[PDB]
Structure formats: structure tokens, C-alpha cells
Design an enzyme around this catalytic site. Structure first.
Site, PDB file in Angstrom:
ATOM      1  N   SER A   9     -38.600   4.679   8.890  1.00 15.00           N
ATOM      2  CA  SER A   9     -39.843   5.623   8.598  1.00 15.00           C
ATOM      3  C   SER A   9     -40.567   5.640  10.309  1.00 15.00           C
ATOM      4  CB  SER A   9     -40.399   6.618   7.600  1.00 15.00           C
ATOM      5  OG  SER A   9     -41.265   5.366   7.377  1.00 15.00           O
ATOM      6  N   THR A  44     -47.260   8.873   2.048  1.00 14.65           N
ATOM      7  CA  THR A  44     -47.787   9.902   1.189  1.00 14.65           C
ATOM      8  C   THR A  44     -48.380   9.477   0.665  1.00 14.65           C
ATOM      9  OG1 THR A  44     -45.450   9.525   0.559  1.00 14.65           O
ATOM     10  CG2 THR A  44     -45.255  11.568   1.074  1.00 14.65           C
ATOM     11  N   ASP A 110     -35.994  -5.283   3.388  1.00 14.55           N
ATOM     12  CA  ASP A 110     -36.322  -5.113   1.917  1.00 14.55           C
ATOM     13  C   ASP A 110     -35.816  -3.706   1.680  1.00 14.55           C
ATOM     14  OD1 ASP A 110     -40.097  -3.727   2.993  1.00 14.55           O
ATOM     15  OD2 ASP A 110     -38.517  -4.866   0.958  1.00 14.55           O
ATOM     16  N   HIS A 221     -54.899 -14.520  -1.114  1.00 16.21           N
ATOM     17  CA  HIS A 221     -56.031 -14.380  -2.199  1.00 16.21           C
ATOM     18  C   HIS A 221     -56.027 -13.026  -1.514  1.00 16.21           C
ATOM     19  CE1 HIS A 221     -59.819 -13.802  -2.909  1.00 16.21           C
ATOM     20  NE2 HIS A 221     -59.712 -15.026  -3.388  1.00 16.21           N
ATOM     21  N   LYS A 222     -56.026 -12.074  -3.764  1.00 13.63           N
ATOM     22  CA  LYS A 222     -55.487 -10.954  -3.136  1.00 13.63           C
ATOM     23  C   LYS A 222     -56.819 -10.004  -2.346  1.00 13.63           C
ATOM     24  CE  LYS A 222     -55.340  -9.773  -7.539  1.00 13.63           C
ATOM     25  NZ  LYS A 222     -54.435  -8.923  -8.630  1.00 13.63           N
ATOM     26  N   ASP A 232     -43.670  -3.708   4.606  1.00 15.80           N
ATOM     27  CA  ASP A 232     -42.519  -3.294   5.990  1.00 15.80           C
ATOM     28  C   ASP A 232     -43.809  -4.181   7.368  1.00 15.80           C
ATOM     29  OD1 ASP A 232     -41.554  -1.473   4.803  1.00 15.80           O
ATOM     30  OD2 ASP A 232     -43.492   0.096   5.508  1.00 15.80           O
TER      31      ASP A 232
END
Ligand SMILES: CC[C@H](CO)Nc1nc(N(C)Cc2ccccc2)c2ncn(C(C)C)c2n1
Length: 309
Positions: A9, A44, A110, A221-222, A232
Site C-alpha cells: 500500500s 486507518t 510479511d 527495548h519497548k 513494513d
């Protein structure tokens, strides 16, 4: 010269799908041919969005155009988020004929279907897509970057530990992809609730048909935000690094995830620098600071160490 056919996309604003994959691959020296499966004002996650989608036949129109001018020669094919099952069946045909026009064509897929929240994951795409991804798509995939929720669905076996997570991957390899990477999972990493855990094994066929299944673990590490398109940007760079390190998944995921963290940190900063205290930043401010992370994309400072096995 390496030419990639990226069917994902596109969006006027933001980095998602192809917008998320192109620039990285381009600055990484790759020749990106991009088919835009859809074109929307933005992803979206926003409150609003408008746009057009490319159907199954139009995807083909473009392929015939490429084929007719005899320029349908590619080294890689990269596909991502897709809603249409007909569109996806079309992607498989293209990939099969491109593998006939012959290069060691690597299909990086993916398998986007949804994401995971501890017990059950919300499916993004329709469930009539699962059969196709499982039955027609993965079989021709070489490198797949699923979620844990995705790896599970694909194999029909749920994941509750690192151990049975490698069992799902081994199950994946059997379906076709010699390389698998679980880009994110529920599993608690040996590093704490603060780190996200990625997994991935490469079943190499060395000379004299021996078996070689190097497995690894990555700990990123978040970050205090909900980003869009990280999947992507990941698969795109993975494509890039596995090319450089064909049998060293260890180093490929390292460079991949390291650049991942560099961009996400730079992102979350400008999103904050752009949002007053006490107000949660918007999908708009959370858009990846892509153009800005160029160098980091080019040369990722290794801040992560892949745990072998
Ligand atoms: C699925 C959920 C998200 C929202 O957070 N929306 C969204 N929206 C996307 N949009 C931009 C494409 C698009 C626009 C309208 C309808 C279908 C697809 C999109 N493209 C790639 N990705 C992900 C897999 C990184 C995209 N994600």
C-alpha cells in the site's frame, strides 16, 4: 544491482506499506519497483481516511505492462498487508512466473493478518485470506516475517513458550520458507516486561544436503507508543541485511532491529517534542521520522546482540 518488486500500500501522508519500505531500501542501495496496492490519504489508525484500492485485475494490468516490455526480471519480491484474497492469489501467480524468469528470486512475505494481545488476536483481514496465505502464499515464500498471532494461525498451533515457538517455526520451514522471523510475540523475554522479543531460525541447505537450522533471539527495548507500519519497515530492511548476510540470520536481524530502535526512538521524541505534556500524541505525530533516520537506516549502530539459539 538488485531489483525488488514491492507490492504494498501507498499513502499520501505517513509511512506505511510501500511508503515504509521504499526509502529505506532505496538508501540501502536497492532498486525498488513499487506497485501501490492502494492509495489512501493516510493509514486507518486515523479518525478519517479516503482512498482508492487497486483490484486483482489492475494488479495484473501493471504486470502485463512490465511483461510486455520484457522488463519483468527481478531479484526480490516483497509483499505485505493485503485485504483482497483475489489480489493475493494474483500475487502468487506473479511470484511463480517471476521465479521462472530466473534469478535466485527471493520472495520476502510479511503474512499480515492481525496482531496479538495475550489470549486472542484481533484479525485485521477477512478470515478467507488465511487459507490462501497458508495454502498458496507461504509455500512460495522464502522469508516470512509473521507475528506470533500470525505464526500460530498459519500453523493452526498456538504458542505458549520459546520452545514451542521454535516448533511453530520448524513447522513453517516445512511449508517452504527457509527463513522465519517472529517479529513480535507475547512471550516474556529474559530481559523483563520492558523488552519486546523477536525470534527467528534459518534452515540452511549446505553442500551435500546437510541440515543447518541456526535459531536466534532479539530483545528490543519497548517504546511508549503505538506505531503503525513498523512491520513494513522491518521486513524491508531485513530484506536488505539478509542479502548482505545470506547465512548469518544473526547479523541480519541485529542490523535490522538496531535500525528499528534508532528510528522508533527518533520518532517518539519528535512526537513528544510536538505534543504538550498530559496529551497523548496522535497517529499523525507518531508517523515514523523516516527521512530523518536515513544514516541510521544506512549504518545501524548495533545496540542489540542476537542470542544464538
Ligand atoms: C490495520 C491497522 C492499521 C491501523 O493501525 N491501518 C493500516 N492501514 C493501511 N492503509 C494505509 C492502507 C489501506 C488504506 C485503506 C484501506 C486498506 C488499506 C496500511 N498499509 C499497511 N499497514 C500496516 C499493516 C502497517 C496499514 N495499516
Amino acid at each position: 544491482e538488485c531489483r525488488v518488486l514491492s507490492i504494498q500500500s501507498h499513502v499520501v501522508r505517513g509511512y506505511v506499506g510501500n511508503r515504509a519500505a521504499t526509502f529505506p531500501l532505496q538508501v540501502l542501495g536497492f532498486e525498488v519497483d513499487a506497485v501501490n496496492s492502494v492509495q489512501f490519504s493516510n493509514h486507518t489508525g486515523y479518525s478519517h481516511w479516503k482512498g482508492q484500492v487497486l483490484n486483482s485485475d489492475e494488479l495484473q494490468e501493471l504486470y502485463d505492462g512490465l511483461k510486455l516490455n520484457h522488463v519483468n526480471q527481478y531479484d526480490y519480491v516483497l509483499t505485505g498487508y493485503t485485504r483482497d484474497k483475489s489480489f493475493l492469489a494474483m500475487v502468487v501467480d506473479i511470484v511463480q512466473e517471476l521465479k521462472q524468469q530466473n534469478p535466485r528470486l527471493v520472495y520476502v512475505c510479511d503474512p499480515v493478518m492481525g496482531d496479538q494481545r495475550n489470549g486472542e488476536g484481533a484479525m485485521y483481514v477477512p478470515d478467507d485470506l488465511l487459507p490462501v496465505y497458508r495454502e498458496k502464499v507461504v509455500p512460495v515464500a522464502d522469508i516470512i516475517t509473521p507475528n506470533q498471532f500470525e505464526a500460530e494461525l498459519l500453523t493452526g498451533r498456538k504458542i505458549h513458550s520459546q520452545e514451542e515457538a521454535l516448533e511453530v517455526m520448524d513447522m513453517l520451514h516445512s511449508m517452504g520458507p527457509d527463513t522465519v522471523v517472529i517479529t513480535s510475540s507475547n512471550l516474556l523475554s529474559p530481559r523483563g516486561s520492558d523488552y519486546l522479543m523477536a525470534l527467528g531460525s534459518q534452515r540452511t541447505r549446505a553442500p551435500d544436503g546437510s541440515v543447518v537450522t541456526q535459531r536466534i533471539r532479539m530483545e528490543m527495548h519497548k517504546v511508549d507508543a503505538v506505531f503503525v507500519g513498523t512491520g513494513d519497515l522491518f521486513a524491508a530492511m531485513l530484506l536488505a541485511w539478509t542479502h548482505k548476510h545470506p547465512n548469518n540470520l544473526k547479523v541480519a536481524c541485529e542490523k535490522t532491529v538496531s535500525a528499528m530502535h534508532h528510528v522508533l526512538q527518533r520518532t517518539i521524541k519528535c512526537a513528544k517534542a510536538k505534543s504538550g505534556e498530559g496529551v497523548k500524541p496522535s497517529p499523525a505525530q507518531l508517523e515514523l521520522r523516516m527521512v530523518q533516520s536515513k544514516k541510521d537506516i544506512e549504518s545501524p549502530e548495533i545496540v542489540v546482540q542476537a542470542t544464538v539459539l
